[PDB]
Design a protein around this nucleic acid. Structure first.
Lengths: 77, 91, 100, 112, 50
RNA sequence: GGAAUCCGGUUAAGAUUCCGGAACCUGGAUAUGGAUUCUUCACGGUAACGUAACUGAAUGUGGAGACGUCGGCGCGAGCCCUGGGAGGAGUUAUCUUUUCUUCUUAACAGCUUAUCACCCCGGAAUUGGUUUAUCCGGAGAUGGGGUCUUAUGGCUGGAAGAGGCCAGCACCUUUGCUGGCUCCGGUGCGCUUGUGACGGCCCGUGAAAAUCCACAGGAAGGAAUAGUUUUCAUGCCAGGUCGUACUGAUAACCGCAGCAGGUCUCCAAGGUGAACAGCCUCUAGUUGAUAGAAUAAUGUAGAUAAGGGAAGUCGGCAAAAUAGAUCCGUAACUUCGGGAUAAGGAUUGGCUCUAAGGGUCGGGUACGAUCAACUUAGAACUGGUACGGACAAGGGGAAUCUG
């Protein structure tokens, strides 16, 4: 119930030792006039709040899932 | 225009109550609903709030007074009596 | 502002079952589409083509998918093809006629 | 035209039983109970609402930090920067007049 | 009533269990003269008066 | 009065209580980070004041809790009305780009958002600003620039994965599986409601306490070879007891009863119409009340009557007549407010036109584009002179006794 806007602040969140799980939600949207694009939502579940990171650039999305820790129970869609 | 001839504010009572009783009400309801000069800021803002209570809008000072006018005829001469009696003490 | 819309009809399924023809159906859209409220004022702003099995309107005037369904349900009522032929959208603005 | 009910067992339209009708993600109307509105804090001298102070119901002032309930001055969330201002004028001039009132009697005891 | 105290809900709990006929094996007992439940209550024939 | 919970789903019957997701509060321990510190207990702003924090006991002060009623105005929410588009259903002798319907976004959280109020610059008569309502200004207006309250709204997270509407395949099955679309507007003396700034009224000025916070005060504890802080962030634990089904009434209550009686309250669609009136419909809910056949008298309820019009009768009892709106015209008397809808007259449909009443945009230091309203007045035509066509809806006057 809280958006995280800094991508490096999102990465320090995943190693906060209560975040056991996360999810990657993909939404088909349009880029404000025409063609569709792929937005992805990186939701980590903390012990008292859910943090969300929206990523519009689908290339930068690919460099982020490899940046996730190997222990996180990532639930794709 | 001039809406009523003589009833004035008391035309809200209509035809009731007896004309001499609506004349004595009109003498005082003009006085209690009028704005008076503030003694303190010199503005005409003092309106009654309740019987004997007279509050000023700006400078917000609330002065106690008569029930329908700010200064009654009795208490004005009282204030000048005690004014006279006090200067017989300092002299 | 000027941009063209395309409303395609799939009349395949009843023409392989004999009840239906697309040529008179393609004719029926021409002499019944109202452009500014009058029939016959089509004039290249709305064209009706017919690919033998795919009827397609290319529209710049006001012409809705609600109006293509209305003119088709009006057509099947004239030719008694209701209770056999339904009008079904399979995608956005790509339509289809159902047999049985 | 979707009529609505109360959600608690108080069926009367009291002060503690206000209703705002809201649309849920189920596409239906449902009433939600709204708490009574917070008043602003008022100044201890002039009575006006004093600015910079958040307006919460009184027990919600224990959940918020110090900077929601204060301004940065003497008499922060108690007086209103103009009653504080006249307080400094009045404290200075009377206590300076008391310095005058000391020595103006020290000439009368020196000349009687 | 529909929002009760426990002392009222306790007295309906007892009077619910007394809302039954005789056990039918009672009538077969030696020298049993009880023919039927003569204290049976119904909600629309006699109110409990709490 | 009051600490704090919402959405979606599930049952034969429970749900703000269960399930999935997502929050918040209280009490409690507590660890790490951020902050503060060599000027020990933070800095910035002229100021209103700002913030991720930024020690503060005794005692004192203050605020919140904490408050009438009515009127009009502004704003919001929901509903209603309406346009395009994307689906579905109905009508189709003829007509109808048509009729109906789905198009939704909770609590909570981050950013932003306002009337009022306040601050700075400036110093106003040729008085200016301004409300629907006339109040404000040298005790500092108009103006330029700002600060705050966050009711409220917008965006994002919650959240599309949910809910909705559809389509295509499957099948004795638990019942599936897979796709789409879920979009952008407009309007208002509309209805309900909340709210704000006001105004009227009172010989009526329209509760209290728990509880919470702030301020003042400076007791006291405090770092430099290292402390201070847990009103900042995250972390951990727990939150007992009792009620929770159903009716709420022409069958669940009280009336000896499954009695035309009585019994407190919330929500509240469309048309006509001033209207929460009557009359008709949508959603939802009923179709319950012993029936069948005949149509005597007399009833009860509803009506109509030629000519006369109270002759009936204790008495115009009962019924009839009148009635809405617009325009005209209104008497005696009066406590001058009234009487008064006095009395008494005229008009009223449908259709086709005319005229007047508005919003927003660009003018360097006279106008035009465009958009959106129902109100009022008039003209022509028309009809078995009808038109408040049903519904709804004053009879009036001249006096006497009396309060």
């Amino acid at each position: 119930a809280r958006e995280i806007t800094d991508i490096k602040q999102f990465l320090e969140l995943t190693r906060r030792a209560d975040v056991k799980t996360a999810t990657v939600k993909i939404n088909k949207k349009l880029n404000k006039a025409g063609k569709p694009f792929r937005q992805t939502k990186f939701k980590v579940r903390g012990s008292s709040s859910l943090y969300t990171l929206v990523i519009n650039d689908a290339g930068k999305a690919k460099k982020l899932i490899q940046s996730l820790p190997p222990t996180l129970k990532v639930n794709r869609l | 225009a001039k809406r009523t001839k003589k009833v004035g504010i008391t035309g809200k009572y209509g035809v009731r109550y007896g004309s001499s009783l609506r004349r004595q009400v009109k003498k005082l309801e003009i006085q209690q609903h009028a704005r008076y000069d503030c003694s303190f800021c010199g503005k005409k803002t003092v309106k009654r709030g309740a019987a004997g209570i007279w509050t000023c809008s700006c400078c917000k000072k609330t002065v106690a007074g008569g029930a329908y006018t700010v200064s009654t005829a009795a208490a004005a001469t009282v204030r000048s009596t005690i004014r006279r009696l006090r200067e017989m003490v300092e002299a | 502002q000027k941009i063209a819309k395309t409303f395609t009809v799939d009349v395949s399924s009843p023409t392989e079952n004999g009840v239906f023809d697309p040529a008179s159906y393609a004719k029926y859209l021409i002499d019944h589409i109202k452009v500014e409220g009058a029939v016959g004022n089509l004039g290249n702003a709305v064209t009706v083509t017919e690919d033998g099995t795919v009827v397609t309107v290319v529209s710049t005037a006001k012409f809705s998918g609600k109006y293509l369904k209305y003119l088709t349900k009006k057509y099947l009522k004239k030719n008694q093809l209701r209770d056999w032929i339904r009008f079904v959208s399979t995608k956005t603005n790509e339509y289809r006629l159902a047999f049985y | 035209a979707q009529r609505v009910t109360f959600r608690r067992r108080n069926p009367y339209n009291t002060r503690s039983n206000k209703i705002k009708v809201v649309k849920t993600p189920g596409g239906i109307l449902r009433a939600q109970h709204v708490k009574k509105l917070a008043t602003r804090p008022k100044c201890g001298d002039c009575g006006s609402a004093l600015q910079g102070i958040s307006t919460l119901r009184p027990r919600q002032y224990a959940t918020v930090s110090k900077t929601h309930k204060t301004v940065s001055r003497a008499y922060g969330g108690s007086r209103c920067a103009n009653c504080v201002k006249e307080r400094i004028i009045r404290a200075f001039l009377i206590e300076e007049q008391k310095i005058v009132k000391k020595v103006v009697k020290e000439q009368t005891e020196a000349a009687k | 009533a529909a929002q009760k105290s426990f002392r009222i809900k306790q007295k309906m709990a007892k009077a619910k269990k007394q809302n039954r006929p005789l056990p039918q094996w009672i009538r077969l007992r030696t020298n049993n003269t009880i023919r039927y439940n003569a204290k049976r209550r119904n909600w629309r024939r006699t109110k409990m008066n709490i």
